[PDB]
Amino acid sequence: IGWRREGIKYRRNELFLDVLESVNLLMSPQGQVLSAHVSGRVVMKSYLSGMPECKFGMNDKIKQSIAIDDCTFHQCVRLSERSISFIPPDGEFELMRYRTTKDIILPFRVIPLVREVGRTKLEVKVVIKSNFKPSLLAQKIEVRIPTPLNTSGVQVICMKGKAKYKASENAIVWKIKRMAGMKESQISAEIELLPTNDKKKWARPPISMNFEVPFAPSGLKVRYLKVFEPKLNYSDHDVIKWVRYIGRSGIYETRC
């Protein structure tokens, strides 16, 4: 085993699992999913005695069951339900990398609305709805709404979070520290427009979001991390085990 030494010992045998995923979405103004996928990886950080043979089980076999379009593993994994078998390297390492496209849970729905008022103003209203347990909080949310290049100024009203028109980025950036599942918030903005060449219209870029939620958008769930060390005198039940899920947006755009 060239990725793990032979006399490792710890009085506190413990492991931490990280299911990190980036969820990507391209949605129409309608609300139809034009494209969507999750890319994720499971990082394991373990302080286990000896040369443990572990078993990683998740809700594969495709209650809760998800489909994996594809995935690669760390060399320590023994290819051939059919779960993962390995003698992990010590410390932190990437156990596997995977991709999903089906039954993804979109944590946010963005519903935009624009009204043209003459040739002088644009009235914009954007509502965001969190789609996930109420007991879970999202954080680091950011909703970026593009403004036309002939913008002379912007007025915004938002009860939750803080929004700032950024003229150099040609966008109103709305930030929200935390937001629980099954909620709804909105921002209204009035975009003040300068005169422009009447022929060339505005090709509205998509509104885009950023956020971080504590669960895997793919649906993945860790069921168990079994540790067997036949030589040393600690077993599976002696091991303290934790898991955390950090799902973050990648490209999460909504055409408006």
Partner: peptide, 6 residues
């Protein structure tokens, strides 16, 4: 946050 895995 981390949660216990039984």
């Amino acid at each position: 946050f981390y949660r216990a895995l039984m």
